[PDB]
């Protein structure tokens, strides 16, 4: 939105009047204001001639980024920002789909080390927290305050005053304090917020990459279950990575934005350990695995009938399978072999991940929804940017 | 004495300070100057030392009570004042039973043989007897004796469970067991044997053999109920809820495609197993569902009203157990009336727990909840936050933080958790439940911290079919399965086939109502579809409007056909026709219909709604039916017609007065106390009807929703519930419904009047005869007989028909429909004719007709065109003349009939006017009119209507002289006297009264009881100016 606007803020003063209506007649097409053809002069304008080519090719996201690139700026990475930045405080908000907590781990590791994750949970966490805050600034280690918004009542009383008082934090050793927000969620105090630097972690992983990150931790659990279970836990890693993938794209996809957690996987995996612990390892237990996963574990949140069916139809495909599943077009997952090694099967199922390459068309090929839907969604987020820009210009 | 007995060091130190302060005050008062007090020795020193010691006593009591509370953690539920009464009342012992209702929730009072406790009784009425009767002595603490009781009461439930369980296993009839075992116990025994008999039945597939078997127990229990004592009547009914669930599941199982299909269905259900293995018997029962098991704790529940089993219900029970298994809090969000707390309560009962419900933000103290939370974490109970969402942000934060401690304490299993700045221990049997009603914003949220501590679920209304089938089963089924499917399809079908109309509701509440209406109807006919079909048209139809009135008939007979003929066909009808003949009314297709629809509804429904256009016939329908019932039954009726919105909620329901909080009756509650409190006369044999004629709104119905409920009792704002008899029927007549909630509709019976009950002619017919009656009291029968003959021959319906049709083809200021104009005509016509009665004695028969026809043509004009432009009047005048006989006396704009001062004469002349002569000083005078062609014209008509006694609304532009014409016509005459009230945007109904009080004199004449006539003998006129201002 700021790209398209800022581009119009410069170019309307600088370029021709013939330019102004041409680009606005284009922003009108991306929006639902109008559909028209801009003013053409041979080799009169070429940058502009290139943009309408994006808009006429029905290609939305490309045309939206055009305004960013036309600025010819190197678009700064969290680390770049942090290094340039001249403050000991940062608050990075993000949508509930992700958390930059693990980006901050690799950010600290690659330069200046000193990483300390501090959950704000109960009284003990806040109480331990305030101790580790005052001491890390003397010491100069980096500190993180995970998901402050929840523990907020405390912020306005202790942290609001504490961070304001700490103009001795300027005096204190190289140290940087980080806080994680959620955009959709309770409002942080504006005074504290304006004082501290702000970032938005907009960084979304692919299906395969989330699968590999889900299945990645799973080896640290140890061993209390059968070999066969690791297959079910693998299945779930794919399943979870497929509903989360579907969460962003709405309306086409899910009716509403719904948020699925590490808690949702956990309550699903716990039911899986439980079904194998109670049954024979005959494969057929699969029937009520689906109903419980699709209606209590994951359908708990879901309220609309429309979406409850989507969870179910996903369970139909992810869970019920005999010999061959074919989660995605590229990848077939075969049922545990007679060799029956649990160490081997982890390594086999890890290898199935390492063999596959996530295609160009993932959102339509992998997530069972049509390609036509994806473009419809691309169109809608275009319309939203295009509108809000027009609206901004007319307001001033 | 008892409190100072328990605390010796505390009362010895209190009384020592009481001495000092007694001398300090009396010394300081006699000084006689407050300021003089600073000169007094050791006053700041004395009081600072005294307050320190008074604070040491309060603190010491606080340490005593908390040490008392920790010993018996039920006392956490009680609080200080109640707690002290218990320690004080120890001598008595029996006086603690009051407070048990609170600290248990299940029981109401305790049973003694004085020295020994024989058992307890529940709030439901159920009698539980203990195994060992607990012995009581003088030197015993409440803490010690009660703690034994809690133990024994749970043990006593295990006893009554094993005793019973064993019996049924030895093939005993369930009707036998009922009589001897408490419900809680028989329920669990049923569940465990059911479960075991169906568990085996999965392997064998002997389902049919067990099904009929169970079905027989159902029928057996049903017929037992009908002839049973009210107490045990609750117990059988409560068991029925459960038995029906049993059979339903088995039947579902008999049906399954495969064994895997059956083992899926069985996984989803709550399966109640027992350990025939182990010791610690109170831990011997456990429950399975979706793989998860749950230990039945043995708490007494009494006999609570048991929630009917739905698939949706089990799912809720399933999510609750899924949360609990992983040490997470249960939480469901969703619309109010989705019974989220009922579920949490029920899910507790099913596992032998009485869940504590915190009704949150119903002016609820944080201090009390903080105590309750400590109590719950000690006692290991389940607590449910009933609509958690509605808490104020400081409270919400404080509470939400506390709750996290508990849920975090359980998840980790921390032995002691700290909350409310103290180290208190945590039972792991503890759980917190949150119900989240939605806001105006959307479906509510848990605070962030609670999101990773709870599991949220979306409650949804039950797909109705399942609930319907059961309800049909309970009544006396015939074929319950067919009915339930058919009924729902029909209701579903009406919804997609009928017009989307405001007040139409075809959801379950509606079918539960059809089914509720059904019970008496079954008594009439059968436990058959036919009884269903009649109940459908008894409820569905009286609220339908003509287009949808056939959609109902079309699809009802399409989906199920029952019968040819109706009973109570002659009987009521002749009692209805004889009522209207007497009332003046005409028995029309429609009038009969809406009279019948109503008659049959009062029978079932106690709250009735009548919706229609103003002048539908609603007051006439109900007034006519009610009248017909006193002919057919022989029962008197006593009607109270109350304008709902004239009075305030305070004037009507009961107002409590802000400072002295003094309770005074009101209007609605006070007329019930004649019936309830002191039925001194004949009320038992009488029928009481309280009618609300005015527009109905939420605020007013909400304050009496309890009478509309299954309750049939009135809840005071403070300090009572008053029960309502079956005689006492509440009616509601109104013009629209837009304001009311669908909830309010569906508790009552609704009668939508699609069109006016009666024919235009039929209205006039009645109106005439109504007017004649008034005149019999002031006109001789010879005069009257001749004058009513005249009216019949002068105006025939055929002529007027076109005239009333042409009325519409005209601009009408201050719009009022043609039908409602009719009374304005008839009253005028009859009065103008009764005016010239003496000149009808001797006048020519041809000439007489001309006087009649003219007056009727006049009266008819003003009543249809009087509110018209008069440019339009003049237009209408030719229209009237047109449709009346051509030769008959024509109407002119200024047309009038005249007679001589000193000799009887007869001629028709118009527009003869006085001239006014007035001096210079007289020029402006607040009562001065320069008579015009139009002054006389208006003053004449205006005065004529008052002689009719019909109220007059004068509409027009400012300064047009509506006020002048009105005032001058009346400041002149002896008959009437004027009082002017000027209305503004916000004028009160007292303003009307206050203004009247100067010119009105109340007299208690036995003829009308209290009367408010005018302070002098001759008539009064209130002039209400700017009536469309308030
Ligand atoms: N026949 C008449 N002769 C002399 N003056 C008249 C006559 N009719 C009306 N007027 C004048 O018109 C004015 C009428 O005002 P008034 O009757 O007080 O208000 P209104 O027309 O009745 N409207 P409202 O009282 O607000 O419903 C007076 O001030 C008279 O001076
Ligand atoms: N069968 C009939 N024959 C003749 N006139 C009738 C008949 N039924 C009703 N009426 C006329 O309709 C009127 C009935 O008044 P009623 O109080 O019922 O109107 P309403 O619809 O209740 O108005 P509101 O909604 O303001 O209460 C009577 O004045 C009567 O003249
Ligand atoms: Mg009426």
Which domains are delineated in chain A? 1-75+369-396 (1.20.1280.160), 76-203 (3.40.50.300), 204-368 (1.10.8.720)
Q: Within 10 A of B518 (CB to CB), how many other CB atoms are there?
A: 24
3-state SS class at B775: helix
Q: Distance of CA B460 to CAs B19, B333, B439, B696, B1004, Å?
A: 67, 9, 16, 30, 60
**What burial class does residue A17 get, using C-beta atoms within 10 Å of its C-beta: 0-12 exposed, 13-18 middle, 19+ buried?**
exposed
**Edge-first strand listing for the sheet containing B107-112:** B107-112, B116-122, B127-135
What homologous superfamily does CATH list for B155-310? Dynein motor heavy chain, linker domain, subdomain 4 (1.20.58.1120)
B749 beta partners? B608
Place of tokens 């009496």: B704
The rounded distance, in Å, linking the Cα atoms of B162 and B102 is 29
Q: Which of B408, B449, B458 sits opposite A303 (nearest CB)?
A: B458
Place of tokens 């015009």: B932
CB B409 within 8 A of CB B417: yes
Report how far apart the first and last C-alpha atoms of chain B are (Å, whole number): 64
Interface size A-B, in CB pairs within 8 Å, comes to 73
CB B185 within 8 A of CB B191: no
Nearest to B614 by CA among B733, B731, B504: B733
Nearest to B297 by CA among B313, B311, B281, B312: B281
Q: Do domains B155-310 and B568-757 have the same CATH topology?
A: no
Ligand nearest to the CA of B734: 2
Q: For A262, name the nearest residue in chain B, comparing CA atoms only.
A: B452
Q: What separation in Å is there between the alpha carbon of B759 and the centre of ligand 3? A: 17
CB B700 within 8 A of CB B644: yes
Task: Give the CA dihedral B35, B37, B40, B46, nearest 10 degrees.
Answer: -140
Q: How many CA atoms lie within 13 A of A317 on its CB side?
A: 18
Say if ligand 1 is within 6 A of residue B960 CB.
yes
3-state SS class at A146: strand
CB A243 within 8 A of CB A293: no
Place of tokens 């590229």: A330
The rounded distance, in Å, linking the Cα atoms of B510 and B747 is 9
Q: What separation in Å is there between the alpha carbon of B931 and the centre of ligand 1? A: 12
Residues 6+ apart with CB under 8 A from A380: A251
The rounded distance, in Å, linking the Cα atoms of B327 and B324 is 5
Peptide bond into A251 cis (omega under 30): yes
DSSP 8-state code for residue A172: S
Neighboring chain A residues of B318 at a CB cutoff of 8 Å: 292, 296
Say if ligand 2 is within 6 A of residue B758 CB.
yes
Say if ligand 1 is within 6 A of residue B982 CB.
no
Sign of the CA dihedral running B322, B327, B328, B330? positive
Q: Within 10 A of B686 (CB to CB), how many other CB atoms are there?
A: 15
Say if ligand 2 is within 6 A of residue B624 CB.
no
Q: How is B380-415 classified by DSSP, letter by letter? A: T-EEEEETTTS--HHHHHHHHHHHHHHHHHHHHT-S
Q: What separation in Å is there between the alpha carbon of B495 and the centre of ligand 3? A: 31
Parallel/antiparallel/unpaired status of strands B1009-1011 and B1003-1005? antiparallel
Sign of the CA dihedral running A256, A261, A265, A266? negative
CATH match for B461-567 among 3.40.50.720, 1.10.10.60, 2.70.170.10, 1.10.8.710 = 1.10.8.710
DSSP 8-state code for residue A319: T
CB B646 within 8 A of CB B694: yes
Nearest to B365 by CA among B391, B383, B385: B391
User: In b/e form, how buried is each residue of A328-362, taking b as 16+ CB within 10 angstroms?
Assistant: beebebeebeeeeebeebbebbeebbeeeebeeeb
Task: Give the CA dihedral A205, A209, A210, A214, nearest 10 degrees.
Answer: -150
Q: Is A185 on the interface with B (CB under 8 A)?
A: yes
CATH architecture of B758-913: Orthogonal Bundle (1.10)
The rounded distance, in Å, linking the Cα atoms of B897 and B877 is 16
CB A245 within 8 A of CB A363: yes
Resolution of this model in Å is 3.6
Q: How is B939-1003 classified by DSSP, letter by letter? A: HHHHHHHHHHT--------TTSSHHHHHHHHHHH-SS-EEEEEE--TT--HHHHHHHHHTTB--E
Q: For A302, name the nearest residue in chain B, comparing CA atoms only.
A: B458
Residues 6+ apart with CB under 8 A from B519: B475
Q: Within 10 A of B527 (CB to CB), how many other CB atoms are there?
A: 19
Atom of ligand 1 nearest to the CA of B962: 22
Atom of ligand 1 nearest to the CA of B963: 22
Q: What separation in Å is there between the alpha carbon of B450 and the centre of ligand 1? A: 72
The rounded distance, in Å, linking the Cα atoms of A146 and A36 is 49
The rounded distance, in Å, linking the Cα atoms of B932 and A201 is 87
Q: Distance of CA A217 to CAs A222, A243, A261, B757, Å?
A: 11, 19, 15, 77
Q: Within 10 A of B152 (CB to CB), how many other CB atoms are there?
A: 19
Angle between helices A207-217 and A227-248 (to 10 degrees): 140
Q: For B458, name the nearest residue in chain A, comparing CA atoms only.
A: A303
Residue B88 assigned as binding residue: no
Q: Distance of CA A71 to CAs A9, A46, A74, A246, B417, Å?
A: 12, 16, 9, 33, 57
Parallel/antiparallel/unpaired status of strands B713-715 and B749-752? unpaired
Annotation: CATH topology of B72-154? Split barrel-like (3.20.180)
CATH no. of B568-757: 3.40.50.300
Q: What are phi and psi of B458, to 5 degrees?
A: -100, 105
The rounded distance, in Å, linking the Cα atoms of A292 and B320 is 13
Q: Distance of CA B734 to CAs B13, B502, B610, B613, Å?
A: 69, 15, 6, 8
CB A345 within 8 A of CB A357: no
Place of tokens 């005048």: B877
Least Cα separation, residue A63 to chain B (angstroms): 35
DSSP 8-state code for residue B907: B
Sign of the CA dihedral running B707, B712, B715, B720? positive
Q: How is A57-98 classified by DSSP, letter by letter? A: TT-HHHHHHHHHHTT------HHHHHHH---SEEEEEE-TT-
Ligand nearest to the CA of B619: 2
Chain A residues 223-242 with a CB less than 8 Å from chain B: none
Q: How many CA atoms lie within 13 A of B168 on its CB side?
A: 27
CATH match for B311-460 among 3.40.50.2300, 2.40.50.1020, 3.30.230.70, 3.40.50.300 = 3.40.50.300
Parallel/antiparallel/unpaired status of strands B454-458 and B116-122? unpaired
Q: Within 10 A of B720 (CB to CB), how many other CB atoms are there?
A: 12
CB B587 within 8 A of CB B577: yes
Say if ligand 1 is within 6 A of residue B983 CB.
no
Q: Distance of CA B601 to CAs A159, B517, B536, B595, Å?
A: 67, 9, 12, 10
């Amino acid at each position: 939105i700021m790209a398209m606007t800022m581009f119009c803020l410069y170019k309307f003063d600088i370029e021709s009047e013939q330019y102004k209506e041409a680009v606005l007649t284009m922003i009108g097409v991306l929006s639902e204001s109008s559909d028209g053809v801009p003013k053409l002069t041979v080799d009169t304008n070429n940058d502009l001639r290139y943009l309408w080519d994006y808009v006429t090719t029905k290609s939305y996201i490309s045309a939206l980024n055009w305004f960013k690139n036309e600025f010819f700026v190197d678009e700064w990475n969290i680390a770049d920002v942090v290094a340039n930045s001249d403050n000991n405080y940062f608050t990075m908000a993000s949508e509930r789909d992700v958390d930059g907590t693990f980006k901050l781990i690799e950010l600290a590791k690659a330069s200046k080390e000193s990483l300390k994750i501090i959950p704000l949970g109960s009284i003990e966490n806040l109480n331990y927290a305030q101790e580790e805050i005052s001491k890390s600034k003397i010491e100069g280690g980096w500190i993180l305050l995970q998901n402050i918004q929840m523990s907020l009542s405390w912020v306005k009383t202790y942290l609001h005053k504490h961070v304001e008082e700490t103009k001795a934090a300027e005096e204190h050793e190289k140290f940087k304090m980080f806080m994680t927000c959620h955009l959709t969620g309770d409002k942080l105090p504006a005074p504290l917020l304006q004082r501290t630097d702000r970032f938005v972690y907009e960084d979304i992983p692919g299906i395969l990459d989330t699968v590999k990150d889900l299945w990645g931790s799973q080896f640290f659990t140890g061993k209390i279950s059968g070999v066969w279970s690791v297959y079910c836990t693998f299945l779930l890693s794919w399943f979870h990575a497929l509903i989360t993938a579907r969460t962003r794209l709405v309306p086409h996809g899910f009716s509403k934005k719904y948020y699925f957690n590490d808690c949702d996987f956990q309550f699903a995996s716990v039911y899986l350990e439980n079904v194998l612990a109670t049954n024979s390892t005959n494969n057929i237990p699969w029937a009520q695995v689906r109903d419980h996963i699709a209606t209590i574990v994951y359908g708990g949140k879901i309220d609309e009938e429309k979406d409850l069916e989507v969870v179910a139809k996903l369970c139909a495909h992810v869970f019920c399978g005999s010999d061959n599943l074919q989660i995605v077009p590229g990848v077939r997952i075969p049922q545990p072999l007679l060799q029956q090694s649990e160490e081997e099967e982890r390594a086999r199922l890890t290898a199935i991940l390492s063999n596959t390459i996530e295609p160009a068309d993932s959102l339509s090929s992998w997530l069972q929804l049509p390609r036509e839907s994806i473009l419809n969604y691309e169109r809608l987020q275009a319309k939203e940017v295009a509108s809000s820009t027009e609206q901004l210009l007319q307001e001033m | 004495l008892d409190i100072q007995n328990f605390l010796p060091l505390e009362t010895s130190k209190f009384k020592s300070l009481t001495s000092e302060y007694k001398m300090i005050t009396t010394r300081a008062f006699q000084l006689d100057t407050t300021i003089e007090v600073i000169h007094i020795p050791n006053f700041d020193t004395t009081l600072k030392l005294t307050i320190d010691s008074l604070k040491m006593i309060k603190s010491s009591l606080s340490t005593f009570l908390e040490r008392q509370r920790r010993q018996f953690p039920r006392f956490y539920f009680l609080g200080n004042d109640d707690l002290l009464k218990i320690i004080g009342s120890g001598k008595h012992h029996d006086q603690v039973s009051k407070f048990m209702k609170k600290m248990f929730g299940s029981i109401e009072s305790i049973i003694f043989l004085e020295d020994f406790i024989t058992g307890v009784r529940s709030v439901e009425g159920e009698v539980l007897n203990l195994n060992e009767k607990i012995e009581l002595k003088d030197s015993i603490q409440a803490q010690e004796w009660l703690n034994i009781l809690d133990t024994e009461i749970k043990l006593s439930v295990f006893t009554q469970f094993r005793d019973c369980l064993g019996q049924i296993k030895d093939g005993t009839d369930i009707e036998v067991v009922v009589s001897k075992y408490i419900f809680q116990a028989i329920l669990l025994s049923a569940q465990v044997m059911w479960t075991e008999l169906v568990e085996k039945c999965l392997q064998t597939n002997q389902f049919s053999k067990y099904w009929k078997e169970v079905d027989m127990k159902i029928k057996g229990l049903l017929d037992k109920l009908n002839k049973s004592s009210d107490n045990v009547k609750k117990k059988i009914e409560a068991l029925l809820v459960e038995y029906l669930h049993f059979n339903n599941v088995i039947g579902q199982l008999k049906n399954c495609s495969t064994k895997e299909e059956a083992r899926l269905l069985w996984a989803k259900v709550q399966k109640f197993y027992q350990k025939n293995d182990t010791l610690d018997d109170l831990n011997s029962v456990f429950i399975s569902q979706s793989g998860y098991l749950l230990q039945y704790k043995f708490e007494y529940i009494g006999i609570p009203e048991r929630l009917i089993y739905t698939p949706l219900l089990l799912i809720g029970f399933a999510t609750l157990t899924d949360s609990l298994h992983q040490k997470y809090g249960g939480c469901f969000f969703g619309p109010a009336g989705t019974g989220k707390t009922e579920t949490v309560k029920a899910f507790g009962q099913n596992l032998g727990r009485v869940v504590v419900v915190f009704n949150c933000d119903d002016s609820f103290d944080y201090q009390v909840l903080s105590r309750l939370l400590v109590g719950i974490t000690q006692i290991g109970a389940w607590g449910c936050f009933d609509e958690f969402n509605r808490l104020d942000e400081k409270v919400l934060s404080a509470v939400s933080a506390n709750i996290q401690q508990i849920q975090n304490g359980l998840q980790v299993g921390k032995s002691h958790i700290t909350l409310l700045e103290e180290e208190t221990p945590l039972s792991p049997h503890t759980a917190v439940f949150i119900t989240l009603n939605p806001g105006y914003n959307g479906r509510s949220e848990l605070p962030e911290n609670l999101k990773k501590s709870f599991r949220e679920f979306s409650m949804k209304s039950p797909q109705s079919g399942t609930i319907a089938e059961m309800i049909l089963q309970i009544m006396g089924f015939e074929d319950s399965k067919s009915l339930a499917s058919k009924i729902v399809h029909f209701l579903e079908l009406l919804s997609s086939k009928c017009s989307s109309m405001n007040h139409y509701h075809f959801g379950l509440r509606t079918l539960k109502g059809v089914l509720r209406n059904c019970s008496p109807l079954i008594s009439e006919f059968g436990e058959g579809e036919k009884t269903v079909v009649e109940s459908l048209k008894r409820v569905i139809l009286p609220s339908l409007g003509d287009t949808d009135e056939l959609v109902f008939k079309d699809e009802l007979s399409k989906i199920f056909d029952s019968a040819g003929t109706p009973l109570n066909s002659k009987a009521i009808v002749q009692c209805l026709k004889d009522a209207g003949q007497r009332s003046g009314f005409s028995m029309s297709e429609e009038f009969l219909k809406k009279c019948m629809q109503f008659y049959y509804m009062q029978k079932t429904q106690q709250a009735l709604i009548l919706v229609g256009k103003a002048g539908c016939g609603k007051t006439a329908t109900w007034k006519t039916v009610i009248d017909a019932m006193a002919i057919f039954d022989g029962h008197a009726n006593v009607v109270y017609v109350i304008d709902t919105k004239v009075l305030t909620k305070e004037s009507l329901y009961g107002s409590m007065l802000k400072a002295t909080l003094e309770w005074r009756d009101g209007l609605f509650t006070s007329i019930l106390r004649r019936v309830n409190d002191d039925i001194t006369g004949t009320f038992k044999n009488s029928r009481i009807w309280v009618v609300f004629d005015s527009d109905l709104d939420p605020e007013y119905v909400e304050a009496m929703n309890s009478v509309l409920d299954d309750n049939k009792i009135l809840t005071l704002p403070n300090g009572e519930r008053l029960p309502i008899p079956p005689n006492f029927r509440i009616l509601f007549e109104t013009d629209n419904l837009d304001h009311t909630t669908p909830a309010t509709i569906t508790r009552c019976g609704l009668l939508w009047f699609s069109t006016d009950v009666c024919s235009i002619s039929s209205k006039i017919d009645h109106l005439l005869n109504k007017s004649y009656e008034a005149l019999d009291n002031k006109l001789s029968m010879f005069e009257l007989d001749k004058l009513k003959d005249l009216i019949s021959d002068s105006f025939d319906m055929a002529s007027l028909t076109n005239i009333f049709t042409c009325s519409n083809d005209l601009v009408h200021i201050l719009g009022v429909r043609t039908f409602n104009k009719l009374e304005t005509a008839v009253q005028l016509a009859v009065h103008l004719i009764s005016s010239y009665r003496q000149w009808f004695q001797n006048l020519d028969d041809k000439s007489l007709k001309d006087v009649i026809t003219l007056l009727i043509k006049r009266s008819l004009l003003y009543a249809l065109a009087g509110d018209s432009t008069g440019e339009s009047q003049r237009a209408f005048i030719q229209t009237i003349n047109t449709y009346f006989g051509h030769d008959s006396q024509e109407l002119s704009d200024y047309s009038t009939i005249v007679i001589a001062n000193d000799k009887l004469s007869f001629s028709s002349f118009c527009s003869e006017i006085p001239s006014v002569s007035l001096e210079a000083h007289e020029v402006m005078r607040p009562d001065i009119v320069i008579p015009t062609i139009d002054t006389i014209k208006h003053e004449k008509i205006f005065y004529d209507l008052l002689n009719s006694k019909r109220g007059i609304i004068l509409c027009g532009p400012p300064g047009s002289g509506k006020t002048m014409i009105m005032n001058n016509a009346l400041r002149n005459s002896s008959l009437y006297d004027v009082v002017g009230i000027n209305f503004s945007k916000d004028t009160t109904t007292e303003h009307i009264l206050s203004a009247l009080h100067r010119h009105t004199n109340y007299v208690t004449t036995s003829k009308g009881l209290t009367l408010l006539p005018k302070s002098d003998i001759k008539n009064l006129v209130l002039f209400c100016d700017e009536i469309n201002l308030p």
